[PDB]
Each structure stands twice: as structure tokens, then as C-alpha cells.
Amino acid sequence: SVPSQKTYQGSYGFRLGFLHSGTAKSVTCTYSPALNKLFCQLAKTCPVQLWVDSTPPPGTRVRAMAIYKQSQHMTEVVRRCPHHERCSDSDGLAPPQHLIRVEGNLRAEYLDDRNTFRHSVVVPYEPPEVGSDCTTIHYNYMCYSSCMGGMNRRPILTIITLEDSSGNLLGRDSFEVCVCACPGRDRRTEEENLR
């Protein structure tokens, strides 16, 4: 099958947020609202904010999953390429085949769906702390969009779902991702081609 990618704020008014990092040649992660696309370097921190109008129940979780954006590739499981799945750079929790990892959260769980074979990483939803208005999850993408035998230049979408303790849908948002050597220049080039 194919995971839904329909934006759904749900009962708790769930939606994502991104920092404003700019497009300098040196930037490691930058988000383009015009393209709803995140550009980031390989295995660098990608801060993703979680915004809600009201706090969801204890036990609520947040899942991240990648799918190919192009319909002709949608049924293919997004995974790391033959080279990166074998480079032994595991952090001791993420399976080596998984494209998306969560940084600094010992409660992250990695799932290999026994039915769809798709990969995902899920963490408990934590309400914002004192002085903060949102919660931030730090993601890492472990393969370049251009990796041969892997994404092979095919664009991907990351789908973030807010789920209850049973895995039922409470909210959903998504964004395109391009893991590349120079996020600042590529974002500028793509926004130009759009203009």
C-alpha cells in the first residue's frame, strides 16, 4: 500500500514548524516554505517543531516515515542505499537500513512494519517545557537523495503523524526532503526555478 499524506490538524490542532536558517552556502539544514521542502546535509541535525493548540493525552506518540513523492515510486520502501546500510554508523538503536533517525532520545523506537515492510521511527510526544511554546524533535537523514541503489535522485516526502497509544491517527503533516551537499544553494536554485 501507500501511507496517506493528507494534512490533518485533528482535534489537537497539530502542525509542524521549522526554524528560519537562511540560505548561506554553509547552512546545514534549511526549510523552504514556498516549496514545503527541507534541504539538509547528510546526517546533520534537522530541528522539526511540533505545534498543538491543546495538549494531547499521555501516551500520545509522534511517528516519522519517508515515502517517494512520485506516484510511480510510491509503493517502493524508502531505505538507505547498499553503501550506507553497510557503513556501520549505527547509534546503537537505529537499524542500519533506516533513512530517518531521531537524535538524543533514548525512548525512540524503530519499526519495520511486518506487513508493509516500511520503516519508521516513533517517540513519545512531550509537551513543551517551561518558557517554550512548542516541542522540537531532532531528525537525521542518513542517505543522500542522489545515492545510487537507494533514493537515486528521486524526491521523498517525510510524513509526521501524531498517534494515540494504539497507533490511531490524531494528526498528520508532511514536507518534501532533499538530502544534499549544499542545502543553501539548492534551496536558492529551486526557489528561483519556481519564481
Q: How far is the CB of 45 from Zn ion (least distance, A)?
A: 18
Binding mask 7-36 for Zn ion (x = CB under 5 A): ------------------------------
For residue 129, count CB atoms less than 10 angstroms from its CB and return exposed for 0-12, middle for 13-18, buried for 19 or more: exposed
40 touches Zn ion by CB under 5 A: no
Q: How far is the CB of 84 from Zn ion (least distance, A)?
A: 3
Q: How far is the CB of 43 from Zn ion (least distance, A)?
A: 10
Q: Which stretch binds Zn ion (CB under 5 A): 40-48, 61-69, 78-86, 169-177?
A: 78-86
Among 63, 84, 119, 172, binds Zn ion (CB under 5 A): 84
Among 48, 67, 147, 162, binds Zn ion (CB under 5 A): 147
81 touches Zn ion by CB under 5 A: yes
Q: Which stretch binds Zn ion (CB under 5 A): 14-22, 80-88, 114-122, 161-169?
A: 80-88
Q: Which residues are annotated as a binding site for Zn(2+)?
A: 81, 84, 143, 147
